[PDB]
Design a protein around this ligand. Sequence first.
Ligand SMILES: [Fe+2]
Length: 818
Amino acid sequence: HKIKGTVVLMPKNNLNAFLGRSVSLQLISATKADAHGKGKVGKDTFLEGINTSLPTLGAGESAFNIHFEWDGSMGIPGAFYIKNYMQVEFFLKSLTLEAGTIRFVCNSWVYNTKLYKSVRIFFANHTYVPSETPAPLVSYREEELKSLRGNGTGERKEYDRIYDYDVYNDLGNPDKSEKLARPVLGGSSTFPYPRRGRTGRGPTVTDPNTEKQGEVFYVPRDENLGHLKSKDALEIGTKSLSQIVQPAFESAFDLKSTPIEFHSFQDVHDLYEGGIKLPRDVISTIIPLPVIKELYRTDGQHILKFPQPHVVQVSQSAWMTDEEFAREMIAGVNPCVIRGLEEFPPKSNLDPAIYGDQSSKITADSLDLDGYTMDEALGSRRLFMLDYHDIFMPYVRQINQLNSAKTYATRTILFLREDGTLKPVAIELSLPHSAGDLSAAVSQVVLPAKEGVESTIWLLAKAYVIVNDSCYHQLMSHWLNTHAAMEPFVIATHRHLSVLHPIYKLLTPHYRNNMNINALARQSLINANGIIETTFLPSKYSVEMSSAVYKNWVFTDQALPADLIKRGVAIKDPSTPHGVRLLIEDYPYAADGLEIWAAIKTWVQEYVPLYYARDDDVKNDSELQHWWKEAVEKGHGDLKDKPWWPKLQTLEDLVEVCLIIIWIASALHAAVGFGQYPYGGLIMNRPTASRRLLPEKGTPEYEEMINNHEKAYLRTITSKLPTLISLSVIEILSTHASDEVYLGQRDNPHWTSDSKALQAFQKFGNKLKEIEEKLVRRNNDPSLQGNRLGPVQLPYTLLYPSSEEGLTFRGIPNSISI
Ligand SMILES: [Fe+2]
């Protein structure tokens, strides 16, 4: 007769306005069809009343009673239509129907019916490959997909749920100034790039190839995550930083209310001790904003205090040590660039006709390898390098033509000591050299030194290295390889895999907040004259450098074992648990990452078989095949030709692709992301820019190295004002929202009705817990101290799976969520 159902929803900001004829639902049959084969639809059914029974009821949520006339002729409900007749939208959580129970997991904004082209349809929590879809739901499944894809035209609106691709043509602002014009990134051979979410705002007036600015950069609506607590809206903080807080900081400098430069290292440490005094109206501009009220401690009047960075919590001075400089290449913010070095001297692939002779000036006899010969070091696999020579060299001339930017293309040679720690043994600071250079600056090699001006020169050499490293980290390791590389897979998934699809359910938790942060990023973070361009060395060249890097991006080399082998920091070895032997045995990121990688592998390998018995079952999944084809040929379309893309005709291939996508989105992004403020919150430890080359022996600047080495250093790195802005942004990006969903968690316990999938998932969480105890034990092992803690005494907890809220230096979210 009647089916008792409970609707749980969330009003935008009494429940009684929801009763009456405000909201109707219509059940759809999974089993009885009409003469066109489509599931039969019941009658419009309105909310009956507010349920106060249910005690399991989350915050902001409210439950409503409802009764469906559902009869013999109608069969089993497999979906439902919902119409919202109210003017304001509400967030639908779920429908439960009792009698056994049917569960519908919705988690979607429902706008006023008149705004929707066709009626919002939701499905029950059963999982089906396309060939298993009940026949009465087949056309409903596929029409919902066509609806999500749209038609590639039109300006997207807030309530749209249309997923499509476009190039990075929305970063420049040529209508405001030709100086803010930028190259379109994506869709050419000069500038290949991942695609991003189409917004459709239309061309600028001055350039038909650049998209006009907008106050809100659209994402499909359910990608724009709300938060119950405003403190958790960390992604919007990036937008307030650009629009409100940065200008407020600038004004204090424009009005000469604070010294323009740091004059000593204590001036930097003061930021997290007594604070910085700023004008009352600057404070009062910043202080009441959500996020920025959590970012800084304040007296409400003139003081802002930054949190004390982890890297200085035990020793203020230990970042200066050569031990920590090298340790952070294997356990720092950017732990995935170091390579094995198997010949000496190191070589370049770059054209000597353009840049001059590219031969290394580092001589073997000059290096202290703890009594080893070069041949012994090379052969024992104890020689490594941090090589930014070929990466940076093509951009040095252009960067150094900028006002107040000067860099080298750096190389660092490291030696793996018998005690298992790395030490740095030389830094080569390279400059391009063509006839008809106006500059007389030359390349040079700097070797470690603990006293005198040679010590300062060596500290300045590490700084140039770390400028290189930070730019690479922020633009490549971080932006390109996580945020940018993942968005095409997000878009493809929603375009081609139905919410009913097992691989949809598998992957989509690993996309939470990714489109949203990326869009806010295109607007405020990587835009023309945005945060990154105004805080980091390459200025207007930054994002385009990441395009140049993308030329060499290989999907299958994002797999952790493949990465470690390609970089020469491990070798394949089947006698081992993970199939590889580390050449740096206490390499924290890699050792811990392999543990996470294996756990994700086991989980995918257990999930996939539940839905695909054989390789044929993969080949014949038409959604799956359309998904992958588009993700490659459209989403990463500039690399579509490349031979290394898995073909996706086998269970092996499906598992491989899912495993890698999940790896990028969770542990890789975590390992590169949540260290930014812990390590970089001391600007001297992770400088973002350099402003001068090394001084000539005859000059006042050289005498400053002798007489005031802290000032020389500070004059060389990021200025005070850009430091304040970059500290503020990395502080945001290193903070876990209280409402994050971590690896081994899902936002709903009823995401599927398949108990087998649910039990596999619980084993995965149990393993991650198991892994966490093991990493604790590694951090507590006194013989691992040198690489896992260092002289900074900072336990490597970046790949601990779990965390509480905040700036914690641990915790692996499911997704790229900040
Ligand atoms: Fe991030």
